[PDB]
Amino acid sequence: MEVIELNKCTSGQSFEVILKPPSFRDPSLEEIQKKLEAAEERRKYQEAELLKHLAE
Amino acid sequence: MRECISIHVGQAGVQIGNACWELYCLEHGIQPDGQMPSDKTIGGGDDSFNTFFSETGAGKHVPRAVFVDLEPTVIDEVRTGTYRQLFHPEQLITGKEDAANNYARGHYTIGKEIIDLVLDRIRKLADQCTGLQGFLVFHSFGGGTGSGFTSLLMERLSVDYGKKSKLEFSIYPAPQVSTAVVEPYNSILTTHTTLEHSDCAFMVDNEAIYDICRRNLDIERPTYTNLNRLISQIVSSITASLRFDGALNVDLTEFQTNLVPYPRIHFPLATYAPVISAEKAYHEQLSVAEITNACFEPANQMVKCDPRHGKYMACCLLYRGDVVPKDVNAAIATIKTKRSIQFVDWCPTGFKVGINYQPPTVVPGGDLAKVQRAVCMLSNTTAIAEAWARLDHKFDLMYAKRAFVHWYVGEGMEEGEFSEAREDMAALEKDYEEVGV
Amino acid sequence: REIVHIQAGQCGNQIGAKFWEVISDEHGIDPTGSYHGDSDLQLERINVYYNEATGNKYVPRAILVDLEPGTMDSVRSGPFGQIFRPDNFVFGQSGAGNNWAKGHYTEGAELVDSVLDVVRKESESCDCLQGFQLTHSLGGGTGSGMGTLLISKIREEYPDRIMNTFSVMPSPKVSDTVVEPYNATLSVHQLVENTDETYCIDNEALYDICFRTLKLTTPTYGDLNHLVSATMSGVTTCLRFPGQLNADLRKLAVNMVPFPRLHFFMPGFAPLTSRQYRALTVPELTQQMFDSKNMMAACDPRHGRYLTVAAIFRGRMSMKEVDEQMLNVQNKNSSYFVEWIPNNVKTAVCDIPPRGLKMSATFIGNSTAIQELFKRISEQFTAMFRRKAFLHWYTGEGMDEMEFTEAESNMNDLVSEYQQYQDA
Amino acid sequence: MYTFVVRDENSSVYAEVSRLLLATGQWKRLRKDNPRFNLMLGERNRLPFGRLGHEPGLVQLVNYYRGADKLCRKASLVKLIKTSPELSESCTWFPESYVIYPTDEREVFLAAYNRRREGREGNVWIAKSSGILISSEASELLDFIDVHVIQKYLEKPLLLEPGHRKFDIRSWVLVDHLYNIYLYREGVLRTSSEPYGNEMFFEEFNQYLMDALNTTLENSILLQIKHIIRSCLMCIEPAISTKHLHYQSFQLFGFDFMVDEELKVWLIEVNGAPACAQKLYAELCQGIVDVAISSVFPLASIFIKLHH
Ligand SMILES: Nc1nc2c(ncn2[C@@H]2O[C@H](COP(=O)(O)OP(=O)(O)OP(=O)(O)O)[C@@H](O)[C@H]2O)c(=O)[nH]1
Ligand SMILES: Nc1ncnc2c1ncn2[C@@H]1O[C@H](COP(=O)(O)OP(=O)(O)CP(=O)(O)O)[C@@H](O)[C@H]1O
Ligand SMILES: Nc1nc2c(ncn2[C@@H]2O[C@H](COP(=O)(O)OP(=O)(O)O)[C@@H](O)[C@H]2O)c(=O)[nH]1
Ligand SMILES: [Ca+2]
Ligand SMILES: [Ca+2]
Ligand SMILES: [Mg+2]
Ligand SMILES: [Mg+2]
Ligand SMILES: [Mg+2]
């Protein structure tokens, strides 16, 4: 094996033991605010159709 | 010292958060009233524990956390709990009616009403940081808030904190404690929308935690309190490197560097040992080799799966207690010759080890017994994809008949998002496939 | 999370009245509205069904509706009659004559606006209104005709609220008039469109349970309503006490209704032999709970498949044995549960048992065998409508034969829709 | 009342097992896609091991060992023998083999080929994959490939008399959830009637060895067979054992052996889904239920346990 990058301190210590070497954009606020309002529109439309059905 | 802000969403996230901060105070020696006698620098701090706690002129150490829930009942218990004096009112955000286990209701309908408030409250803690590293987001997959509202928050956070890192602690749904039939829907919906916004996510399957409590703790019918106290231990050892002096996983960026070579494959498997029942009259304290060997037993993993039939991309060993590097390498040597541990060709076969001398802390009067040494392994193994296949199969069974889909469309969602999310999970399973074979 | 209760017509009020007598006893509320219990679990979710008035008294959030004063006078003078809010007694004088048209179009129209005013006064006081629950029959005129009218208008004013009903189905065994199939078919169409959750309570099943099981030679409506009280108390346990499974009306609908039109449930109760000294074992509750003999809908569960199931155990018992007994039922008869809805059986446990029992179990089933109930009503309906018999009672109130053809057609669609998922 | 599913309709063996199970009155067969099952007779390819062992209150058992293909695919079997130190180049019961990809040990395969080319020794090889070609010139067999495997061809096989025939031995081995290795007491020899239903069982073959070679099947052959079976299964045990796993596995294997004129046993290949002999279907399929099924799901020897 191989132990490397051994760092010690009062709290403890760390290291890395190697056994074998290797064989060898996020959407904008506008686009988010757009989809959130698109979903609210589809709700309002579905609700309007119900209130239209009840009016009949 | 760079600060870390914790965000707890939904019942699971809030209750798990309450268990973790209780454990943090016990470990750091912070009393329920926010006082910390061992802290000599009053009102100001550049220490490792200050990455999770701020300080007031009066000497209170306030968690850098924000609780959010679309229902007040769960967060009300924190407002009147043992650590009420710990948090200030601005940190606890609650609505009136929850998401009713509906992803669309928590993401679109109700989420849109409170998203700006939460971000503003988060900005309150961000402005009080000198060098914010990022966020730790606790939530469930099945809950309507934990799944729906978390994906919306993860989106906005990437817009307001594009440079910061974001880590997840996600509760994978298990029917033995499940509360809704559509939890597979919510799990896949929230994973699709959050995948590109999470740098490193630690999944915890309630099934695994449930069985661990039954076998190793002798609890006939474990409760959320039993599960969370055990989950907090795993979370504590994972975040211990951020709260104490050390050299491994010193900042959130290091988690992605050590465990996530591929962005999409950012779901490391966590194994913990030993889990000893405090009821046992006497138990023989396990050695370094015994607890290290237990890290390769599936019965101790946070997600039941067989790493033998997969390949590793990175492994980290986190020891808490009486452990010296010499004993670790000796245990690793014997384990290599008696276990199947295959790494990917382009990755070196090795272990990043970290040792903190303070033994693990257990809630007085809890279920876990105090041990002299414990370990938590964080292995990025393709075997964890078994959990994705399970979810995706249940998803396919229900979606083929469109069962329960109307509840989501009625909240503003479109069936197209169902297929998109499923296709994304289908791609995720293939990524594990090729990397794993 | 307040719930607004409405009871309409003779049956709706007699059953609704008994319901408030059962839960008032469980929550430790006397006929005066004064709490006299010994456990905080009785008051933790007391606000779901009771308003806290001045003097620390508890007023049921119930609206008593009827086109005749008769039955409501009995309630006002009954055991718990004093506890009901006087203003909430909205009634007419003419009646409905067991005529769906009179309750839905003519007589009921005059009185409906008066009821909505009381409903509005109750809703405006609610901190977070879950929705409404309606108790009524479908064979009469007021509860069936006017009840469905109220639901349609309640939904118009509260479209984002849950609509829940306990609906008594007519049966020739316990029949008042021959036009009951007409009124039921007309009402079912309304329920299929304007409710989220409907507990199908079949008077035929109630009668058979009283006769065959309870060994009651001459069952009365009082004996039938005893079963309805026990069932109504059970199905609402998860709503009236602390818990996490189906704790409110919406989360219940999300777990129980995979398709919007298929929201008619089969209720079951155990131990059925109620109205006795030896309590049952957890295995016994589970067995009887799923036994068709304890079903209130008069449908053979083995003639269909379970889309979703909601179990509720009450009393101090081994939750472990409950979990393994529920898993035993599913794994022992997995063919009767659709395999395209994984884990469609959810189980809840409540510490407080019902009155007189140390242990009980309530069953709520969304089975495709419920079609047997609708197919039965449809056959009786067509038997008369095919000869236009007794239609004059309805055409005289402005209705046209076309509206009957549509209702008949809508219910046959409901039957065919239930038959679709019983084979998938 | 235990439940089980059938996801491999082409399984002649487990078609009999599922028949005996039902005939016991304590096993109910479910729909092949029903999750609430105790035992799965899984399909032969792409068995969803990842979905097993996640049903509360269900002890789930499957008739396959995940990862056993490493021993049943000829290409991977060679890699297992040449790579695993437990076997390595010390095992003298496996023919010299090489893996060659059709455009890889092609360069090393020719190295030993020239060794026999230089010498006057026999240089006859065989090329097969998971259509065969036996050739003495390495060129004739390589052109045939274009993944296959090329191994030494037993030029001096044991011949049955009279007839001057060639044969091979098939042994059925059962591994239960505890990893007990049970060798079926009955075997079959598949013979070639042409000089170098064609089934010679052990009873007859044993008498021939006594009357012809003055030995017994046990001493001259069966010892080496039990050694090869034990060695192969004990090597991959850490990789496939379901001792502490959320689901249990068992599996019936089919080992094919070759015997040379020196009474030496050679391993040809291992079959993960073998078919039994018509005469032995009943006895063996009953043993599967006794040892592999009823052991985990009790109800209201024909095997030889190989210790380890
Ligand atoms: N480990 C653990 N899991 C929990 C806990 N609370 C809830 N869960 C899991 O979370 C899932 C349900 O999601 P919840 O968090 O309860 O729902 P929510 O986030 O409050 O969102 P809503 O649907 O609006 O109520 C279930 O599968 C539970 O198993 C907890 O305290 N600990
Ligand atoms: N190295 C070798 N030396 C001599 N003969 C060999 C040999 N490899 C194979 N053979 C001959 O080839 C025949 C078929 O070999 P093999 O067992 O690979 O076929 P197979 O896998 O298609 C059928 P099964 O499913 O029963 O294993 C055997 O009967 C054997 O006699
Ligand atoms: N279970 C039960 N059913 C009833 C009761 N009273 C009437 N019914 C049934 O309801 C139908 C009559 O409707 P009813 O409610 O009396 O007429 P309404 O006053 O116009 O609502 C018949 O089919 C009866 O069987 C009762 O007290 N209990
Ligand atoms: Ca300080
Ligand atoms: Ca980012
Ligand atoms: Mg919630
Ligand atoms: Mg009447
Ligand atoms: Mg073969």
Author numbering:
A (entry chain E): 6 to 29, 43 to 74
B (entry chain A): 1 to 437
C (entry chain B): 2 to 42, 45 to 278, 282 to 360, 369 to 438
D (entry chain F): 1 to 103, 126 to 152, 159 to 174, 179 to 228, 259 to 362, 373 to 380
Task: Please give me the paper's original passages concerning this structure.
Crystals of the T2R‐TTL protein complex, containing two ɑ,β‐tubulin dimers, the stathmin‐protein RB3 and the tubulin tyrosine ligase TTL were grown as described by Prota et al. All of the tested ligands were bound to the maytansine site of the β‐tubulin chain in the T2R‐TTL complex. Maytansine site ligands bind at a shallow pocket at the top of the tubulin β‐subunit where the interaction with a longitudinal aligned tubulin dimer in the protofilament takes place, thereby inhibiting the addition of tubulin subunits at the plus ends of growing microtubules. According to the proposed mechanism of action, maytansine poisons the growing ends of MTs by occupying a pocket on β‐tubulin that is essential for the accommodation of helix H8 of the longitudinally aligned α‐tubulin molecules during MT growth.
Additionally, 4 a–c establish a hydrogen bond to the main chain carbonyl group of Gly100 via their C9‐OH group. In Figure 7, we show the binding pose of the best resolved maytansinoid 4 a and compare it to 5 a, as well as the maytansine orientation. Briefly, all compounds form hydrogen‐bonds between the C1‐O and the main chain nitrogen atom of Val181 and between the C24‐O and the side chains of Lys105 and Asn102. In the studied maytansinoids, all the modifications introduced at the C3 position point towards the solvent and do not perturb the close environment of the maytansine site. For the larger C3 substituents, such as the phenyl ring, we observed a slight reorientation of the C3 carbonyl group, which increases the distance to the Asn101 carbonyl group, thereby weakening this interaction. However, our biological assays showed that this minor change in coordination of the ligand does not have an impact on the efficacy and the binding constants. On the other hand, compound 4 a with a phenolic ester at position C3 was a slightly weaker binder (51 nM). The cytotoxicities determined in this study correlated well with the binding affinities: compounds with high affinity 4 a–c behaved nearly as maytansine, showing nano‐ to sub‐nanomolar cytotoxicities, while compounds with sub‐micromolar and micromolar affinities were less cytotoxic. With 4 a 10 nM concentrations in interphasic cells and 5 nM in mitotic cells are enough to observe similar effects to those noticed with Maytansine in interphasic cells.
